[PDB]
Amino acid sequence: MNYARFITAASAARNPSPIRTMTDILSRGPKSMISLAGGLPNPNMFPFKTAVITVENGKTIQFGEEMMKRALQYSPSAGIPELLSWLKQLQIKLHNPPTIHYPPSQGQMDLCVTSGSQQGLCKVFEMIINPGDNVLLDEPAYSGTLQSLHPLGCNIINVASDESGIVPDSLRDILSRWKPEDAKNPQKNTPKFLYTVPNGNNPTGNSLTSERKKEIYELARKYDFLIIEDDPYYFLQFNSGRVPTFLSMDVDGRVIRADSFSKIISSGLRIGFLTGPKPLIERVILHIQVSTLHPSTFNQLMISQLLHEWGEEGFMAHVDRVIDFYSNQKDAILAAADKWLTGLAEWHVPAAGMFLWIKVKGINDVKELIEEKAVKMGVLMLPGNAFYVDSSAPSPYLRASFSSASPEQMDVAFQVLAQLIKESLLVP
């Protein structure tokens, strides 16, 4: 593939740090080397000495004197080597990407640890988007993505979707305005990429099927666009097993995948990872180098130590317990919606994640009913407006999270909503 056409002039202009050549020559010189090269501060000046972190339950992560000095010091831009190698093997085990052994220039599978998956996505959007470029996505979409794309000056083209996510026939119809050969044409503006959240879309809770992913991938090949697979709910699917990902079917090296530890390990530690073709991942790493430099070494070492002790089996057993908890939370929110909202609202059973997307029946805009009337009654939900490119347009939808509230709290919240629907209906 020609990666240069999916890279801005600014992104292509990025050069590596002078410390890259120094690290490459460090592995080509003697063993007992003296370095006065790096701008590394003295680790003995740091006030934190050792650390003990207890793990669920009875287990213990310990940072001795030397490990603590490493944790408090600068580390590689793409992430610590032990976390990268464990994650690489996880990706091979979970997705077996076709690109593992491709030459670097042909999109060889590459990884980098990011400060949450949001950082990876942002660098990816900034690497690709020139003002006026065309991008594809299905609305309602994650507000963070829309807020990230809005300043970039791109035209966002909405792809139709249903309970099984993106409708491939709608994507087929949209793309028919171009001819496949337009992707090679400098005077044509064929879409740079398709962005999607394939499992438990934020805010709908809907997931793509394997069949639909195969059809979407074939259209991405035909019109030569990238697939940005933002999958933070991959490890939060309600069904047993896992639907094959876009990365698993990536024969062309056209998929950039974002994974997150936010919903399973910790959101506050800011650790996620990007998997994709080496020429694109390299552009992202060069941008990280001049911004955050690297993700927290301390946080990476905590997660790396946990993952190595658990192994892939202990990791998957932990995700299984997390899924079990969210599955019960999902049943409790569905039971509250059944009790109070039957006849008043419409909702689908979410396939993954932590949200219930509710459509209020005889109301055009839910914003004032929620942002004002519901708050006064002691209940807060998110109005749907925030999940569309045109956020000023009226929305009868609301997003309700089932991650934290108790069944009794959900019952209170839904009873209130039901009376406010009956209130906004009897108004002349």
Residues 30-69 touching a copy of itself, rule: CB under 8 A, are 30, 32-57, 61
175, 243, 258, 265: residue in contact with a copy of itself (rule CB under 8 A): 265
**Candidate ranges 89-97, 209-217, 338-346, 406-414; the one touching a copy of itself (CB under 8 A):** 406-414
CB of 134 to a copy of itself, least distance (A): 18
Q: Which is nearer to a copy of itself, 170 or 403 (CB)?
A: 403
Asked whether the beta carbons of 86 and 79 are under 8 A apart, the reply is: no
**Tokens in use for 20?**
């890259």
**272 has which bridge partners?**
114, 260
Spell out a b/e string for 380-401, using b for 16 or more CB atoms within 10 Å of the CB, else e: ebbbbbbbbbeeeeebbbbbbe
Tokens of 335: 């039971």
Residues contributing to the site for ligand 0LD (CB under 6 A): 19, 38-40, 74-75, 116-118, 142, 144, 197, 202, 230, 232, 260, 262, 267, 272, 293
Residue 195 tokens, joined: 């962005």
**CB nearer a copy of itself, residue 204 or residue 248:** 204
Residue 264 contacts which entry, ligand 0LD, a copy of itself, none (Cβ below 5-8 A, type-dependent)? a copy of itself
Annotated binding site for substrate: 20, 74, 142, 202, 399
Binding-site members are 20, 74, 142, 202, 399
Residue type, 238: F
Smallest CA-to-CA distance from 106 within 251, 205, 272 is with 251
Instruction: Tell me the window of 23-31, 81-89, 251-259, 337-345 that interacts with a copy of itself (CB under 8 A).
Output: 23-31
Cα atoms found within 13 Å of the Cα of residue 293, Cβ hemisphere only: 8
For residue 252, give the nearest of 290, 286, 219, 274 by alpha carbon.
Answer: 219
220-239: contacts with a copy of itself (CB under 8 A): none
Choice from 410, 418, 420, 421 touching a copy of itself (CB under 8 A): 410
Q: Which does 230 bind (CB under 5 to 8 A by kind): a copy of itself, ligand 0LD, none?
A: ligand 0LD
Query: How far is Cα 251 from Cα 226, in angstroms, rounded to an integer?
Result: 12
Q: Which two tokens stand for residue 115?
A: 């400060």
**Which of ligand 0LD, a copy of itself, none interacts with 197 (beta carbon under 5 to 8 A by kind)?**
ligand 0LD
Contacting residues for 63 by C-beta, under 8 A, at least 6 apart? 50, 51, 52, 53, 71, 301
Binding mask 177-206 for a copy of itself (x = CB under 8 A): -------------------------x----
- Coil, helix or strand at residue 15: coil
Give the footprint of a copy of itself on residues 280-339 (CB under 8 A). Answer: 289-299, 302, 306, 318, 321-322, 325-326, 329
Residues in contact with a copy of itself, shown as a per-residue x/- string from 125 to 164 under the rule CB under 8 A: ------------------xx--xx-xxxx-----------
Q: How many CB atoms lie within 10 A of CB 219?
A: 18
Window 67 to 126, contacts with a copy of itself (CB under 8 A) = 70-75, 115-116, 118-119, 122-123
What torsion do the CA atoms of 7, 11, 14, 17 make, to the nearest 10 degrees?
Answer: -100
For residue 355, the SS3 value is strand
Least separation in angstroms between residue 76's CB and ligand 0LD is 6
The one among 67, 160, 167, 379 contacting a copy of itself by CB under 8 A: 379
Residue 104 tokens read as: 């670097």
Residue 178 contact among ligand 0LD, a copy of itself, none, beta carbon within 5 to 8 Å by kind? none
